[PDB]
mmCIF file of C-alpha atoms in Angstrom:
data_model
loop_
_atom_site.group_PDB
_atom_site.id
_atom_site.type_symbol
_atom_site.label_atom_id
_atom_site.label_comp_id
_atom_site.label_asym_id
_atom_site.label_seq_id
_atom_site.Cartn_x
_atom_site.Cartn_y
_atom_site.Cartn_z
ATOM 1 C CA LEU A 891 176.974 70.675 28.230
ATOM 2 C CA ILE A 892 180.499 69.720 27.152
ATOM 3 C CA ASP A 893 179.617 70.443 23.512
ATOM 4 C CA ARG A 894 183.077 69.174 22.574
ATOM 5 C CA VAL A 895 181.712 67.420 19.470
ATOM 6 C CA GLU A 896 182.237 70.748 17.737
ATOM 7 C CA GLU A 897 185.817 70.685 19.000
ATOM 8 C CA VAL A 898 186.312 67.059 17.966
ATOM 9 C CA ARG A 899 184.891 67.883 14.539
ATOM 10 C CA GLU A 900 187.296 70.798 14.145
ATOM 11 C CA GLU A 901 190.078 68.404 15.125
ATOM 12 C CA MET A 902 188.787 66.021 12.462
ATOM 13 C CA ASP A 903 188.807 68.786 9.878
ATOM 14 C CA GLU A 904 192.381 69.660 10.805
ATOM 15 C CA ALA A 905 193.657 66.080 10.913
ATOM 16 C CA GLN A 906 191.915 65.086 7.682
ATOM 17 C CA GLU A 907 193.257 68.220 5.999
ATOM 18 C CA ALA A 908 196.713 67.318 7.304
ATOM 19 C CA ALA A 909 196.395 63.826 5.838
ATOM 20 C CA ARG A 910 195.130 65.272 2.554
ATOM 21 C CA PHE A 911 198.036 67.730 2.401
ATOM 22 C CA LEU A 912 200.444 64.905 3.246
ATOM 23 C CA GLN A 913 199.057 63.001 0.279
ATOM 24 C CA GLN A 914 199.145 66.170 -1.832
ATOM 25 C CA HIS A 915 202.781 67.108 -1.142
ATOM 26 C CA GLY A 916 204.233 64.127 0.712
ATOM 27 C CA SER A 917 206.550 63.420 -2.211
ATOM 28 C CA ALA A 918 207.613 67.054 -2.598
ATOM 29 C CA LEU A 919 208.363 67.381 1.115
ATOM 30 C CA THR A 920 210.301 64.109 1.185
ATOM 31 C CA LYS A 921 212.360 65.149 -1.841
ATOM 32 C CA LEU A 922 212.949 68.537 -0.217
ATOM 33 C CA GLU A 923 213.949 67.351 3.252
ATOM 34 C CA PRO A 924 217.380 65.714 2.604
ATOM 35 C CA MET A 925 218.781 68.781 0.800
ATOM 36 C CA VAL A 926 216.967 71.752 2.340
ATOM 37 C CA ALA A 927 220.091 73.772 3.134
ATOM 38 C CA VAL A 928 220.603 74.706 -0.524
ATOM 39 C CA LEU A 929 217.731 77.196 -0.265
ATOM 40 C CA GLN A 930 220.023 79.420 1.816
ATOM 41 C CA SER A 931 222.474 79.717 -1.121
ATOM 42 C CA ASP A 932 221.284 81.411 -4.316
ATOM 43 C CA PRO A 933 223.763 81.203 -7.252
ATOM 44 C CA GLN A 934 224.389 84.940 -7.683
ATOM 45 C CA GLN A 935 224.279 85.332 -3.921
ATOM 46 C CA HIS A 936 227.043 82.717 -3.886
ATOM 47 C CA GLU A 937 229.290 85.185 -5.739
ATOM 48 C CA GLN A 938 228.235 88.089 -3.537
ATOM 49 C CA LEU A 939 228.883 85.685 -0.655
ATOM 50 C CA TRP B 495 214.821 78.695 2.991
ATOM 51 C CA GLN B 496 212.779 80.048 5.900
ATOM 52 C CA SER B 497 209.490 78.940 4.382
ATOM 53 C CA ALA B 498 210.865 75.452 3.766
ATOM 54 C CA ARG B 499 212.102 75.229 7.340
ATOM 55 C CA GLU B 500 208.630 76.201 8.570
ATOM 56 C CA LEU B 501 207.024 73.606 6.295
ATOM 57 C CA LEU B 502 209.337 70.878 7.550
ATOM 58 C CA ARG B 503 208.502 71.978 11.085
ATOM 59 C CA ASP B 504 204.772 71.667 10.458
ATOM 60 C CA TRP B 505 204.742 68.556 8.255
ATOM 61 C CA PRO B 506 205.920 66.140 10.986
ATOM 62 C CA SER B 507 203.150 67.581 13.147
ATOM 63 C CA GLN B 508 200.755 67.036 10.255
ATOM 64 C CA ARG B 509 202.022 63.472 9.972
ATOM 65 C CA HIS B 510 201.899 63.081 13.752
ATOM 66 C CA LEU B 511 198.268 64.205 14.040
ATOM 67 C CA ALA B 512 196.925 62.698 10.806
ATOM 68 C CA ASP B 513 196.760 59.287 12.476
ATOM 69 C CA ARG B 514 194.306 60.714 15.019
ATOM 70 C CA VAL B 515 191.511 61.023 12.437
ATOM 71 C CA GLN B 516 190.268 57.478 13.041
ATOM 72 C CA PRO B 517 190.567 57.602 16.856
ATOM 73 C CA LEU B 518 188.858 60.952 16.461
ATOM 74 C CA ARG B 519 186.183 59.340 14.288
ATOM 75 C CA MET B 520 185.112 56.814 16.908
ATOM 76 C CA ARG B 521 185.580 59.532 19.513
ATOM 77 C CA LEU B 522 183.035 61.789 17.819
ATOM 78 C CA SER B 523 180.668 58.911 17.118
ATOM 79 C CA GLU B 524 180.625 58.053 20.821
ATOM 80 C CA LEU B 525 180.508 61.716 21.853
ATOM 81 C CA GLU B 526 177.595 62.522 19.559
ATOM 82 C CA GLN B 527 175.719 59.431 20.714
ATOM 83 C CA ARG B 528 176.316 60.651 24.251
ATOM 84 C CA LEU B 529 174.986 64.103 23.361
ATOM 85 C CA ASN B 530 171.973 62.426 21.786
ATOM 86 C CA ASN B 531 171.422 60.678 25.104
ATOM 87 C CA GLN B 532 171.929 63.976 26.946
ATOM 88 C CA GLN B 533 169.401 65.740 24.726
ATOM 89 C CA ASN B 534 166.949 62.882 25.217
ATOM 90 C CA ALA B 535 167.409 63.018 28.985
ATOM 91 C CA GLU B 536 166.975 66.800 28.998
ATOM 92 C CA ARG B 537 163.839 66.592 26.868
ATOM 93 C CA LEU B 538 162.323 63.829 29.004
ATOM 94 C CA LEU B 539 163.225 65.717 32.181
ATOM 95 C CA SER B 540 161.441 68.832 30.958
ATOM 96 C CA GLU B 541 158.572 66.649 29.755
ATOM 97 C CA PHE B 542 157.970 65.284 33.237
ATOM 98 C CA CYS B 543 158.726 68.542 35.087
ATOM 99 C CA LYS B 544 155.231 69.753 34.186
ATOM 100 C CA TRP C 495 224.505 63.688 12.562
ATOM 101 C CA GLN C 496 221.910 60.974 11.949
ATOM 102 C CA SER C 497 221.054 60.709 15.633
ATOM 103 C CA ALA C 498 220.647 64.487 15.758
ATOM 104 C CA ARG C 499 218.313 64.454 12.768
ATOM 105 C CA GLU C 500 216.277 61.725 14.453
ATOM 106 C CA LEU C 501 216.155 63.668 17.715
ATOM 107 C CA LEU C 502 214.958 66.858 16.052
ATOM 108 C CA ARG C 503 212.370 64.806 14.189
ATOM 109 C CA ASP C 504 211.234 63.510 17.578
ATOM 110 C CA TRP C 505 211.011 66.974 19.153
ATOM 111 C CA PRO C 506 207.970 68.039 17.063
ATOM 112 C CA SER C 507 206.102 64.863 17.977
ATOM 113 C CA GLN C 508 207.358 65.054 21.556
ATOM 114 C CA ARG C 509 205.918 68.509 22.139
ATOM 115 C CA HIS C 510 202.726 67.897 20.176
ATOM 116 C CA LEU C 511 201.852 64.766 22.126
ATOM 117 C CA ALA C 512 203.026 66.169 25.465
ATOM 118 C CA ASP C 513 200.500 68.949 24.869
ATOM 119 C CA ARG C 514 197.708 66.362 24.873
ATOM 120 C CA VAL C 515 198.224 65.242 28.494
ATOM 121 C CA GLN C 516 195.526 67.243 30.257
ATOM 122 C CA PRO C 517 192.755 66.713 27.671
ATOM 123 C CA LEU C 518 193.599 63.046 27.999
ATOM 124 C CA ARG C 519 193.408 63.310 31.790
ATOM 125 C CA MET C 520 189.742 64.293 31.742
ATOM 126 C CA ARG C 521 189.048 61.575 29.180
ATOM 127 C CA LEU C 522 190.728 59.037 31.452
ATOM 128 C CA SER C 523 188.699 60.227 34.419
ATOM 129 C CA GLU C 524 185.464 60.022 32.428
ATOM 130 C CA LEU C 525 186.259 56.569 31.071
ATOM 131 C CA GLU C 526 187.115 55.539 34.627
ATOM 132 C CA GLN C 527 183.680 56.489 35.919
ATOM 133 C CA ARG C 528 182.280 54.657 32.917
ATOM 134 C CA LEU C 529 184.081 51.485 33.979
ATOM 135 C CA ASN C 530 183.145 52.005 37.613
ATOM 136 C CA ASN C 531 179.485 52.166 36.637
ATOM 137 C CA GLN C 532 179.978 49.117 34.426
ATOM 138 C CA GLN C 533 181.286 47.150 37.398
ATOM 139 C CA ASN C 534 178.497 48.492 39.596
ATOM 140 C CA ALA C 535 175.798 47.454 37.132
ATOM 141 C CA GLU C 536 177.473 44.102 36.481
ATOM 142 C CA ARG C 537 177.635 43.389 40.194
ATOM 143 C CA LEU C 538 174.090 44.510 40.975
ATOM 144 C CA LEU C 539 172.935 42.328 38.098
ATOM 145 C CA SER C 540 174.856 39.364 39.493
ATOM 146 C CA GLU C 541 173.583 39.674 43.057
ATOM 147 C CA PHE C 542 169.991 40.091 41.893
ATOM 148 C CA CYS C 543 170.193 37.225 39.404
ATOM 149 C CA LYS C 544 171.514 35.101 42.252
#
């Protein structure tokens, strides 16, 4: 009575959603990742800084 | 900043686990076939029991 | 710097996949009995058919 097929199907939902989101925002994430640190510095906050 | 850091934390995990869909696919095919066999065995067992 | 970025990219995957050990252990056990039964059936078949 393992009934893990429900579990495997939830895992499928998650992994397929992850792949779909990767397709959806793969480019945005890749363009964000090399220059993420800038988000910590907001122009006016740079003066207040 | 914090949101982006969280996203870049999760996204590698998303990329890491996305590949599992296909191994998962055959996994569930086999598992569901096995449950079909289990259900058949259970039904036949009960059928004979009487 | 580049090595560090690579390492911290690895760490997500490292933890995620390390988490999968035990679920894999039961799968390995199960698949092992499957093979054992395969060998048993294959043998029994061979000795009978001889």
